[PDB]
Symmetry: C2
Subunit: 122 residues, 2 copies
């Protein structure tokens, strides 16, 4: 985690560590405590806009499925934190052996993830 | 521009304003002075990795063409700055009338853009 010094930067880093570990450990147990009631994900697909998932339940369900899909994984390229925001660059490996690079733009409020926006190479 | 308070945040905001104006005004005159000799762009396409453009000349050429392509434009969604980094969310409108949302991750060093990473909805 690259930290830009800022009031809550260390808190946001801790949130991103635990968030990233869900995927690295394929273990979604931490997801609910990290996600705001009103959390929104703007997913990577489909263009033009990306789907939208709203509310803790939808966000937990989506990320849980992602974290536990057989034959898939993520390599973390860089997590950069500043204040209540972070960027997480990654490479996603698919069950067919292909991969794609992407990024999440993350925002926290009251110590929980309220916004996650995903993008990919197209 | 949303600024996260940090040493050079105001400088980075100024760089991003002038960078964004190149596209909004379809005027690439400012590009060279904003771009480091060694600047690298990791473009939005093609998956998996995105092409790579290296050096001021390549980066100026690519962005100049983008800025001046007839029938195309960008809407700025949000520019967020922290320290020597920024994120710029946008919607790109293509000559065929379609659009796609995307984001640039930007990094400056010595007052010039050294790194620009682009991603899109897929
Ligand atoms: Cl990678
Ligand atoms: Cl938009």
């Amino acid at each position: 985690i690259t930290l830009h010094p800022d009031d809550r930067s260390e808190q946001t880093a801790e949130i991103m560590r635990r968030f990233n570990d869900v995927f690295q450990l394929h273990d979604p147990a931490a997801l609910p405590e990290l996600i705001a009631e009103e959390c929104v994900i703007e997913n990577t697909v489909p263009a033009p806009d990306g789907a939208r998932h709203a509310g803790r339940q939808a966000c937990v369900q989506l990320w849980s499925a992602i974290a536990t899909q057989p034959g898939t994984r993520f390599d973390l390229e860089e997590t950069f934190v500043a204040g209540d925001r972070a960027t997480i660059r990654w490479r996603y490996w698919m069950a067919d052996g292909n991969s794609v690079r992407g990024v999440n733009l993350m925002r926290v409020q009251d110590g929980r993830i309220v916004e996650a926006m995903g993008y990919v190479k197209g």
